């Protein structure tokens, strides 16, 4: 649901679906990940607690040199 969903932006253009999913395993189990051009993505986790963990802990985390923005 919406509570399990997180918007990711700020990724390097070349960062892939695989790489992002791997990174967000530090928030919890990913059930959905969709990557758009320009370093954007939408991710869903198993639980709302995972999504909250992503936003609160992985905010401004670095991925392949780029600083992420999560909300």
Residue numbers in the entry: 199 to 269
From the paper:
Kinetoplastid RNA (kRNA) editing takes place in the mitochondria of kinetoplastid protists and creates translatable mRNAs by uridine insertion/deletion. TbRGG2 is a 330 residue protein and contains two main domains, an N-terminal glycine (Gly)-rich region composed of GWG and RG repeats and a C-terminal RNA recognition motif (RRM). Unlike these editing accessory proteins, the T. bruceiRGG2 (TbRGG2) protein is required for editing all nine pan-edited mRNAs. TbRGG2 binds RNA and modulates RNA structure and these functionalities have been shown to be to be essential for its role in kRNA editing.
To address this question we determined crystal structures of the domain, which encompasses residues 203 to 269, from the T. brucei protein. Two apo RRM structures were obtained, one of the RRM(L209M) mutant, which was constructed to aid in crystallographic phasing and one of the WT RRM. Both structures were solved to 1.8 Å to final Rwork/Rfree values of 15.1%/18.7% and 16.5%/19.7%, respectively. The WT RRM structure contains four subunits in the crystallographic asymmetric unit (ASU) and the RRM(L209M) structure contains one. The RRM molecules in the two structures are essentially identical; the Cα atoms of the RRM in both structures can be superimposed with root mean square deviations (rmsds) of 0.4–0.6 Å. The structure shows that the TbRGG2 RRM indeed harbors the characteristic RRM fold composed of a five-stranded anti-parallel β-sheet surrounded by two α-helices (36–37). The TbRGG2 RRM structures revealed no interfaces significant enough to provide stable oligomerization, suggesting the domain itself does not oligomerize. Consistent with this, size exclusion chromatography (SEC) experiments revealed that the RRM domain, even at high concentrations (1 mM), elutes as a monomer.
